[PDB]
Design a protein around this ligand. Structure first.
Ligand SMILES: [Zn+2]
Ligand SMILES: [Zn+2]
Ligand SMILES: [Zn+2]
Ligand SMILES: [Zn+2]
Ligand SMILES: [Zn+2]
Lengths: 191, 380, 115, 322, 258, 52
């Protein structure tokens, strides 16, 4: 107990993570410190058609460009246009206040650690690891429900335009899909 | 007898005249002979390589405070080590570098064995303001290097480089037993001393198969490092050696699309300052982890992220371009336009590829053999 | 690699044995007492300093820590194979310059040579 | 055979000696007399002469006639000489056999590509009045001790020491060199100092990072064993000796290196430098003119104020050698 | 003394242009050729010493295409029109090959630039850039040759600009990123000439002054030796650095090397 | 003296070959640099103490 307490005190970030994972019932303290220690002849027909069309070729001047086309191209290339999109998270350094940013970084670190444990468990070569991956998935789901859902609610309340949760969802969805695919393979191997 | 005590050389007898003006043909021949001064190979040395896990051991004793190399040994050594790391990572795509510093009869692993160039350079720059105290310990440094490299795969060439400034080393135990263990571990050890020759370093280099050298000046130091840059020759086929590595595409994000997803970089998350939450970067093909630098092994799934052009840049050595057959212009009964540059063929010799039987002038042949490394006709 | 001579090694004049031989050489072979003492001292110094070079590939450093060696009467007693390498530049140099010379010599002697 | 060790020159294969001893016009030493008598009684094969440029002298020529030899091979680096006595050397020894092309020699990289410089300094007003006032040969010290040239030399010395470059400073008129070297507290060779002191100074000059700059007074105008140097700064050299400047340039080569020449404007030194560089330009070297020194006022230099500059006038006029 | 060389590579794949003509769209191959000619004329107008070269890539081979208007432009346009007419009229489909021989045209362009560089007087530097307009789909069978061409261009410091019309090409993106060139996808095909004059017409030094669209998301997917297909994760040999899609007990390339 | 430093610097630094070079510099350098290679040539022909 005394030895365990001093480790948390030296790293408050880990202490905050320890509370966010153990007190919130996401993971057990036993598992917490365990890890720490082409087509048909129509193509030839089209080729012949274009050959005949370009057989009688004459240069043109007016048809090459028009005032409307040039204006549209300039508008597209003007600052703030489609190709010149000037927003690109205008003030993301000051958007989504740093109080949320610190929480986002903590969530990123926690998700990275959990996924690192999951991928270290992968590939599953022994039946012992099968339960461990299921426990990791359960811990991931509990952490998501505990933190990301309030995080999403806070983001929606403040109406932040950045899709910060989207990347976290992408990694979690990828991990879930990989686990489901591996389980499907495991079922197929037993057939 | 002597070569210079015989007859005086008359080099001007080469030129001759038969039509009172044929010297133009002779000078044209001289100009033609002036070209093709290369062996049609940019390197001409080792045509292959092997993955190297190189460990650099740096002395941190009081002898590094000596001012033999301005301003002192430590600063010049660190600068040349930064240059060596840059060049080594440039010429070795999938190699790894670890750094160990010996001080006060102990060894500290300054940087983990990895392929990131920026991390090593940052650590070296941080180490400039270290404190030089105590005496070096070769035994501890070699023990740490062996322990780290003991579990490495056999196909990789395990190499250890020691920069030994002090002439004295404190060994807690016998060192020759450690040398025998290293020999059994097939670990190559090379030492570049600074002051003078030391018996133990020479014995270690001889037994481990490495090379021992002594620095004369900064230029000699740089030459020795450059010599150490080159990879060792590799056998034709050793084992089933392969590696699972990904090729992360550099997908940036734009706010024009609805998939503009900011993400903090894994490398930047460990920094004290606010990590760069850029629009996009390099996404891991396996776990979609975001990284800014390459080549960097993935922190999450352990996959190796490498850039395909870096690997492909050395592919021309595997399939070198055959030398074209030199044929005089008169004897070639065909087109008189170069197939590569469309220029008129006026030189006395025309080069014809053995595969596509095209025509290339001297300049185009040199360009193909030196830079292009591929025959334009064979591509078609 | 280095052989240091801390002063000219002079045999003890006591025991009344050296002096008898000196007198015998003086009155029989007309040998100066100081000359014979210097000869014996330099012979012993050279004998104990010349054992650092055994073999063509072998190399070493030889230093004499005494100003008395600087005089010609004692340098001339050194063997000829060492005289030519004892340049007049380093005959009375201080400790720091001697250390610098030793550093340069050892640095330049470590390079490979052929047979 | 130089009357220093007398290593039994009688009965020898190769004998090495020097001039001014084979042509003694006075009584000779008994051992030296016997050695000369032995040496004048047999033929010599390939009599080798070093520094052949100063062969046509009053006493050096008869040295050729005082000994008998079959082949006389002369070697030199600076064949240029005044008094047009080089023509006599054509029949004294033989014809000019080989003349190395210095440009292509340094293009191969085996000779240091020395960047020659000719940078002048303006004459301070406190000195120019006295320079134009005096004409009875007392103006040699005046442009020699120009405060502006002193500042330029100090700036060059400090700049090249900050980058760890070996410097050799040539300076004739040893009287000026005294206060030129003691001001910076740097080693100098007066020239009649001793044999040991010069040898040890030159020996510790190369293998010492603490000290890397020395001053030479016309002593380095011959073939010595001076170590490798990258910077040469000559001040107040001889009148028009192209040989001296060529030799001094030869002490640097062995832009790996570069040498500077400091002269005073509106003085005879301008004409002297112009007329003594015509040999090196024929050799292919070009002297870039430097009129401004970067960062002259960046740091503090000697003679910063006018007080010490005008105080220098009394001590430079204190010679009064009459 | 600033010499600018512009080499324009035109994707003349008959299949893609035939499909475009069948679509009866507002953009045709004739308009593309006219836009290329106008761009070349503008490049020649930019400076007296500017040199122009035009190469058209086809399924067969690479063809060197090079009253009130400029005389030299009149001669240049007529030669290009004659060459493109000769290439298209004599273009006969003989075989199953459909991918454009883009790599060979780039190699010919590099050889031509190397030839022109020597003819330049030593007092002047010939800054050379290559502009490629892409119409057909990218070809993965020529990955190695394309990478070799990119490396040669980078070694000789030659800019490579890609103008993708319909389908994005990863190889062109890699070439633009490595050589420092500009990669742009045309939103509206009829406005192609305006894009070419607005973006690719200025030289690199002028590009520093001007504001240009940021580079697109360049991919770096590698090509497997035994499949020649883009892959994200693959096995790479530690000796010859060859890339394989699936694990093998013995390296095929290292087996070849004895 | 404080003024002695300034007076000596003014006299020495611009005595003969600056009172006309500074005037030409002030009356010139109106147009931009023709090419970047001139700076390279200047750096190659300049001595190391003129580069800082
Ligand atoms: Zn990953
Ligand atoms: Zn050609
Ligand atoms: Zn071919
Ligand atoms: Zn495959
Ligand atoms: Zn292989």
């Amino acid at each position: 107990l005394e030895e365990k307490n001093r480790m948390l005190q030296e790293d408050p970030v880990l202490f905050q993570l320890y509370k966010d994972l153990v007190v919130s019932q996401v993971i057990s303290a036993e598992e917490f410190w365990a890890n720490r220690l082409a087509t048909s002849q129509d193509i030839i027909n089209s080729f012949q058609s274009i050959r005949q069309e370009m057989e009688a070729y004459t240069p043109k001047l007016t048809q090459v460009l028009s005032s409307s086309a040039a204006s549209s191209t300039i508008t597209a290339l003007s600052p703030g246009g489609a190709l010149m999109q000037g927003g690109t998270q205008q003030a993301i350094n000051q958007m989504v206040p740093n109080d949320i940013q610190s929480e986002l970084k903590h969530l990123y670190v926690a998700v990275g650690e959990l996924l690192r444990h999951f991928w270290s468990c992968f590939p599953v070569n022994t039946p012992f690891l099968e339960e461990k991956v299921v426990k990791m998935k359960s811990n991931l789901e509990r952490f998501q429900v505990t933190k990301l859902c309030p995080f999403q609610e806070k983001i929606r309340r403040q109406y932040l335009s950045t899709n910060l949760v989207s990347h976290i969802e992408e990694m979690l969805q990828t991990a879930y899909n990989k686990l489901h695919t591996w389980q499907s393979r495991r079922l197929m191997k037993k057939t | 007898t002597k070569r210079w005590e015989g007859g005086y050389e008359r080099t001007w007898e080469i030129l001759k005249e038969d039509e009172s003006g044929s010297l133009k043909a002779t000078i044209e021949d001289i100009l033609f002979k002036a070209k093709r001064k290369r062996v049609f190979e940019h390197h001409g040395q080792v045509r292959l390589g092997m993955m190297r896990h190189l460990y650099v051991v740096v002395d941190g004793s009081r002898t590094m405070e000596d001012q033999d190399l301005k301003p002192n040994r430590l600063t010049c050594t660190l600068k040349l080590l930064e240059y060596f790391v840059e060049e080594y990572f440039d010429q070795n795509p999938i190699s790894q570098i670890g750094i160990i510093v010996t001080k006060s009869k102990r060894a500290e692993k300054l940087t983990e064995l990895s392929g990131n160039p920026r991390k090593h350079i940052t650590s070296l720059k941080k180490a400039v303001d270290m404190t030089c105290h105590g005496e070096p310990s070769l035994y501890n440094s070699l023990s740490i290097a062996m322990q780290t490299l003991k579990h490495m795969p056999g196909h990789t060439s395990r190499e250890v480089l020691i920069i030994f400034s002090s002439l004295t080393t404190c060994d807690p135990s016998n060192i020759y037993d450690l040398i025998k263990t290293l020999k059994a571990a097939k670990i190559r050890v090379s030492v570049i001393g600074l002051s003078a020759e030391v018996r133990v370093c020479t014995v270690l280099a001889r037994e481990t198969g490495g090379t021992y050298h002594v620095i004369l000046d900064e230029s000699h130091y740089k030459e020795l490092l450059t010599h150490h840059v080159s990879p060792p020759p590799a056998s034709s086929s050793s084992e089933c050696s392969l590696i699972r590595m990904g090729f992360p595409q550099h997908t940036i994000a734009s706010l024009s699309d609805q998939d503009a997803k900011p993400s903090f970089s894994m490398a930047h998350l460990d920094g004290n300052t606010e990590p760069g939450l850029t629009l996009g970067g390099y996404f891991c093909p396996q776990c979609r982890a975001k990284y800014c630098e390459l080549p960097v092994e993935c922190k999450i799934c352990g996959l190796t992220l490498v850039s395909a052009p870096h690997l492909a840049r050395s592919y021309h050595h595997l399939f070198p371009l055959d030398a074209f057959q030199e044929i005089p212009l008169e004897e070639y009964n065909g087109e008189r336009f170069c197939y590569g540059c469309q220029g008129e063929l006026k030189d006395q010799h025309v080069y014809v590829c053995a595969v596509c039987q095209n025509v290339f002038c001297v300049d185009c042949d040199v360009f193909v053999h030196d830079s292009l490394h591929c025959c334009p006709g064979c591509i078609h | 690699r280095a052989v240091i001579m801390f002063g000219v090694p002079y045999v003890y004049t006591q025991s009344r044995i050296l002096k008898a031989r000196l007198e015998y050489l003086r009155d029989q072979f007309q040998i100066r007492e100081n000359d014979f003492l210097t000869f014996d001292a330099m012979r012993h110094a050279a004998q104990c300093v010349g054992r650092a070079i055994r073999g063509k590939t072998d190399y070493g450093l030889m230093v004499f820590a005494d100003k008395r060696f600087a005089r010609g009467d004692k340098r001339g007693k050194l063997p000829r194979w060492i005289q030519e390498h004892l340049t007049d530049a380093n005959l009375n140099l201080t400790v720091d310059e001697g250390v610098q010379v030793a550093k340069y010599f050892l640095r330049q002697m470590a390079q490979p040579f052929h047979r | 055979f130089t009357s220093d060790a007398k290593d039994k020159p009688i009965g020898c294969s190769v004998a090495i000696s020097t001039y001014s001893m084979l042509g003694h016009t006075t009584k000779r030493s008994w051992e030296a007399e016997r050695v000369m008598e032995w040496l004048k009684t047999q033929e010599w094969g390939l009599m080798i002469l070093d520094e052949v440029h100063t062969i046509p002298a009053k006493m050096f020529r008869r040295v050729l006639t005082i000994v008998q030899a079959h082949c006389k091979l002369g070697l030199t680096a600076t064949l240029v000489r005044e008094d047009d006595k080089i023509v006599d050397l054509n029949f004294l020894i033989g014809p000019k056999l080989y003349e190395a092309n210095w440009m292509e020699l340094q293009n191969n990289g085996y000779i240091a590509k020395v960047q020659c410089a000719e940078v002048w300094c303006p004459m301070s007003p406190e000195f120019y009045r006295e320079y134009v006032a005096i004409k009875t040969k007392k103006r040699i010290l005046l442009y020699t001790m120009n405060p502006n040239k002193f500042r330029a030399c100090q700036f060059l010395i400090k700049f090249h020491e900050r980058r760890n470059d070996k410097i050799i400073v040539f300076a004739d008129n040893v009287f000026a060199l005294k206060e030129y070297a003691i001001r910076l507290n740097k080693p100098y060779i007066y020239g009649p100092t001793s044999q040991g002191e010069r040898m040890q100074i030159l020996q510790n000059f190369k293998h010492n990072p603490k000290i890397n700059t020395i001053f030479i007074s016309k002593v380095g105008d011959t073939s010595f064993d001076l170590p490798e140097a990258n910077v040469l700064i000559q001040i107040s050299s001889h009148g028009g000796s192209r040989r001296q400047e060529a030799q001094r340039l030869g002490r640097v080569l062995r832009y790996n290196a570069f040498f500077y020449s400091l002269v005073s404007q509106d003085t005879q030194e301008m004409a002297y430098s112009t007329k003594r560089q015509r040999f090196l330009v024929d050799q292919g070297y070009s002297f870039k003119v430097i009129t401004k020194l970067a960062g002259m006022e960046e740091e503090d230099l000697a003679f910063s104020t006018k007080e010490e500059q005008q105080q220098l006038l009394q001590k430079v006029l204190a010679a009064t050698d009459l | 003394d600033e010499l600018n060389l512009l080499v324009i590579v035109v994707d003349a794949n008959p299949i893609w242009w035939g499909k475009q003509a069948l679509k009866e769209s507002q953009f045709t191959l004739s308009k593309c050729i006219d836009a290329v000619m106008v761009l070349g004329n503008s490049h020649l107008f930019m400076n007296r010493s500017n040199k122009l070269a035009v190469i058209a890539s086809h399924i067969q081979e690479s063809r060197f295409l090079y009253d009130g208007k400029y005389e030299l432009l009149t001669s240049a346009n007529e030669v290009i029109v004659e060459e493109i007419k000769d290439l298209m009229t004599k273009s006969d489909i003989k075989g199953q090959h459909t991918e454009t021989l883009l790599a060979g045209s780039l190699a010919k362009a590099l050889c031509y630039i190397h030839r022109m560089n020597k003819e330049v007087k030593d007092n002047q530097e010939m800054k050379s850039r290559i502009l490629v307009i892409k119409a057909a789909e990218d070809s993965a069978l020529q990955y190695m040759n394309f990478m070799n061409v990119i490396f040669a261009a980078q070694k000789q410091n030659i800019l490579i600009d890609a103008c993708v019309l319909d389908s994005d090409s990863g190889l062109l993106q890699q070439a633009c990123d490595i050589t420092g060139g500009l990669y742009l996808k045309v939103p509206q095909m009829p406005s192609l000439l305006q894009y070419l004059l607005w973006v690719f017409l200025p030289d690199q030094d002028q590009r520093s002054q001007l504001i240009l669209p940021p580079p697109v998301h360049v991919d770096y997917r590698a090509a497997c030796f035994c499949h020649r297909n883009l892959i994200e994760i693959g096995y790479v040999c530690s000796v010859c650095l060859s890339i394989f899609c699936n694990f093998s007990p013995i390296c095929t390339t290292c087996e070849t090397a004895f | 003296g404080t003024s002695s430093q300034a007076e000596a610097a003014r006299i020495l630094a611009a005595s003969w070959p600056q009172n006309r070079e500074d005037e030409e510099k002030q009356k010139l350098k109106g147009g931009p640099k023709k090419t970047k290679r001139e700076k390279k040539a200047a750096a190659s022909h300049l001595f190391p103490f003129e580069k800082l």
